[PDB]
Every structure is written in structure tokens, then in C-alpha cells.
Write a protein that binds this DNA or RNA. Structure first.
Lengths: 96, 94
DNA sequence: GCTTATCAATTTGTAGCACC
DNA sequence: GGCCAAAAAAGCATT
DNA sequence: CGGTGCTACAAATTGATAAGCAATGCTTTTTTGGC
């Protein structure tokens, strides 16, 4: 699968950046996204998709093994809403 | 935070990395992730999350506006699973 | 209005990547 | 970087 | 540049609750390329 190392590599090849900068940039890219998210801000990346936050109340859950009923504590989750452009690019993709 | 705003912030922070460079880099990284999924391959960024594809069986769907039927071929749609670090930093509730 | 995703706890084989 | 008009993309309806 | 130990990650369990979506015209937002 695609990894930061592979992303760093493309930046190195395709854009002739130093391996140093191509490494920090990738890291910062994701870091900046986590940050905007931890501050409760939505992230909209045109051409790709949005990372939205949703607050989910507690609800019935359980232990799939034993079966012991357990509540799913309330929480705030990150969802990704792919855009149309991306969706189209991937509809006929064939899992490598 | 939009893509352009993301480029701004990254640029502002780094004072040793040229703003134009940051711009070309982000665009390229996003394009890299997109084509990666189009090629039917996964993206695994430890601590952030992973992108993969989910299959949707063919199905007789509907134009929600008219009610007219529409035959839908099977397909793949994007799917993101937040990584532990990201899950936690985002979840403000206890 | 119907389909798909979310999630609980635990195990078990895999692999991202920081750190040497 | 700012401003602008044009174009691309997303958002809305409902999705 | 390359080896590797730490551990997040994937998957698979059940079942109540939540989120997402087919088509598409119109509106809004973001990006684009020129100055």
C-alpha cells in the first residue's frame, strides 16, 4: 500500500526536492490535517474529499465474542466524505 | 480548512521551505493518493489512517426525484478508517 | 426507503516507520 | 500575496 | 542507504443504531490563470 516513504519518494523524483524536505513535507501534510481536526475544524480538500467530524451519542453495543452487552460510550469521530471527482476515478478500480 | 488554506498554514510554519514548493508538494501528494486508489491499491498512513475500497453490488436503484428506476452496475467507493492517534486527538469526549 | 457503516472486547498474523 | 473573471468543483434539494 | 523492533493495523465475532445514496438542475464555493 501507499506509505509516507513512497509519497516522499515521488516528491523527490517528480519535484526534485531534497529527501529531507520530501520527508518532512509528507509528515507535516498529515500532521496539519490531524491538527485542524483535533481543533474541531472540518477539512475540505477539493478534488479529493472532506474529513468531517460527527459527535455520536452513547448506544447499545456488546462483546462479539462472549456476547456480553456493553454500551458504546459517546465520542466524536472523523468521517471522510469522498468528492465526486475522486468517486468517479475509483468506481471501476480493480483491487490490486 | 481547504486545500489552499492547508498550503498556507504549512507555508507559514516552515520558513525554510518555499511556499510555491509547499503548494506543488501538497497538490502532488493528493494526486498521488487519488491515482493510488484508482489503481485499486490501499493507502496506509500509520497513526493517521488508511484508505481502501469497498465494493457495491449491482442494484436496481432509483432517481430519488422522479421515482424512475435506474440499473446500477457494481462498483467501488472510497473508504477511510481513522488511525488510533487521529481517532484520539479528534475525540474530545472522554 | 433501502443499503451500508458503525461499534462494543479479544485474539492473531501483518507491516508502517521511527530509530538506530 | 492581492484582485478579478472564468471555470472547475462542490453543495443543495433529498443525497 | 539499510536492518528491525515496537505496535498500530486488519480481520472476524453479534446485533441495535446511524449514516449514506441512486439522477440532476440550479446555486454556491473554491481554484485558476493573468496582471
Amino acid at each position: 500500500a501507499l506509505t509516507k516513504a513512497e509519497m516522499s519518494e515521488y516528491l523527490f523524483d517528480k519535484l526534485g526536492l531534497s529527501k529531507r524536505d520530501a520527508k518532512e513535507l509528507v509528515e507535516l501534510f498529515f500532521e496539519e490535517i490531524r491538527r485542524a481536526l483535533e481543533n474541531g475544524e472540518q477539512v475540505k480538500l477539493s478534488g479529493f474529499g472532506n474529513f468531517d467530524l460527527r459527535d455520536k451519542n452513547q448506544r447499545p453495543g456488546r462483546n462479539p465474542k462472549t456476547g456480553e452487552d456493553i454500551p458504546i460510550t459517546a465520542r466524536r469521530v472523523v468521517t471522510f466524505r469522498p468528492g465526486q471527482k475522486l468517486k468517479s476515478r475509483v468506481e471501476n478500480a480493480s483491487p490490486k | 480548512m481547504t486545500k489552499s488554506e492547508l498550503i498556507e498554514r504549512l507555508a507559514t510554519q516552515q520558513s525554510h521551505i518555499p511556499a510555491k514548493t509547499v503548494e506543488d508538494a501538497v497538490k502532488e501528494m493528493l494526486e498521488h493518493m487519488a491515482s493510488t486508489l484508482a489503481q485499486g491499491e490501499r493507502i496506509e498512513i500509520r497513526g493517521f489512517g488508511s484508505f481502501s475500497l469497498h465494493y457495491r453490488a449491482p442494484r436496481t436503484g432509483r432517481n430519488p426525484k422522479t421515482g424512475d428506476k435506474v440499473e446500477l452496475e457494481g462498483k467501488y467507493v472510497p473508504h477511510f478508517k481513522p488511525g488510533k492517534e487521529l481517532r484520539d486527538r479528534a475525540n474530545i469526549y472522554g
